[PDB]
């Protein structure tokens, strides 16, 4: 049997190796790549459908209320007003982060919030516009599980304002594309992301670095530039690439869609893109947005990933599974 086991192992090894060579040769043609992608899309069609997450109950509900109030207020606010609101809210968030004593008193749970409103108004009623102060008082009125959730809600409202002005201009697609490109480049260079994520370094210096190095280029969307500058400035021990990924995810989620970091071997034909979007939307219920990565080792197929679920169709993964099946 030991001779039999050795014979099986060796024969399987040779067969799998030369089969891998055969696959590498056959898929090398772009038409073969497209055929594999189409087969995977058909399989996904055959596949059956499915069946603010770091926030506690009180903070979840309070942020929901603040977001709804912002949507109510900003429905009639214009692009310049939106930019002013976003800048003001970013400034207020920086103020809270710097002045911890003020933050704790503004974010302490209470049954009557009148003292909070009095503090806010007697503090900065005139320094900021009416909409900014209205949102701030709505935010402090509610109950936050942790005092940090207050700053989170403030920066979230500011981000929503910037995404709203993006919508008003019409560059939602372009701003989301810029955000995802920025996230990819930050991921590819962990050293820069580590440098920017350090809050202990002055925030303004980091904003200047991002402007002069990455965000300042002829082909950078203004909204994406401002939004990343805001996020990097108001950073609290959060890795920069994670922050920009959250930015892009929120930007898409405003439209009800979801990020699908599809990775392919080559750019998908527009018909393939529509097919993929449709199939993924029907699988996961709500519509989705497809973001393409290109990696030669995939040898065709698609390695889809949404949230926490991965559908690994790469031919390389299939080959590896073949090489792990030999007795």
């Amino acid at each position: 049997q030991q001779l039999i086991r050795q014979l099986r192992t060796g024969l399987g090894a040779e067969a799998v190796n030369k089969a891998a060579e055969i696959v590498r040769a056959h898929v090398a043609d772009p038409q073969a790549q497209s055929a594999t992608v189409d087969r995977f899309l058909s399989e996904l069609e055959q596949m059956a459908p499915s069946s603010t997450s770091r926030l506690r109950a009180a903070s979840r509900q309070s942020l929901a209320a603040l977001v709804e109030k912002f949507d109510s207020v900003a429905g009639g606010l214009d692009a310049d007003g939106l930019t002013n609101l976003a800048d003001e809210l970013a400034s207020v968030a920086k103020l809270l982060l710097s002045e911890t004593a003020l933050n704790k008193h503004l974010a302490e749970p209470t049954d009557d919030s009148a003292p909070k409103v009095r503090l806010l108004e007697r503090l900065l009623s005139d320094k900021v516009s009416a909409t900014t102060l209205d949102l701030l008082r709505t935010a402090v009125s509610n109950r936050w599980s942790t005092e940090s959730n207050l700053i989170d809600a403030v920066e979230h409202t500011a981000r929503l304002a910037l995404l709203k002005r993006a919508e008003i201009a019409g560059e939602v697609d372009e701003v989301e594309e810029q955000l995802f490109r920025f996230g990819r480049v930050l991921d590819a260079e962990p050293r820069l992301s580590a440098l920017l994520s350090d809050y202990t370094t002055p925030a303004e210096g980091r904003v200047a670095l991002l402007d002069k190095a990455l965000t300042g280029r002829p082909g950078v969307n203004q909204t994406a530039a401002a939004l990343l500058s805001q996020t990097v400035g108001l950073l609290r021990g959060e890795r920069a690439d994670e922050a920009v990924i959250d930015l892009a995810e929120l930007a898409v989620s405003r439209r009800g869609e979801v990020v699908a970091h599809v990775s392919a071997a080559a750019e998908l034909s527009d018909a393939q893109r529509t097919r993929l979007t449709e199939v993924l939307s029907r699988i996961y219920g709500r519509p989705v947005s497809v973001q393409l990565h290109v990696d030669p080792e995939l040898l065709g197929g698609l390695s889809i990933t949404v949230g926490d679920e991965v559908i690994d169709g790469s031919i390389a993964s299939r080959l590896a599974a073949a090489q792990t099946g030999l007795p």
């Binding site: 260079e189 820069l192 440098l195 370094t201 210096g205 200047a208 670095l209 002069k212 190095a213 990455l214």
Partner: peptide, 27 residues
């Protein structure tokens, strides 16, 4: 990546409780 490297080196050079020279908080 030439521009980004130049800019980041420029910034870090300019940049270069308390007593940086034990944790990111204090000694």
């Amino acid at each position: 990546a030439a521009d980004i490297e130049g800019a980041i080196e420029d910034y870090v050079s300019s940049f270069s409780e308390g007593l940086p020279s034990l944790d990111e908080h204090s000694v």
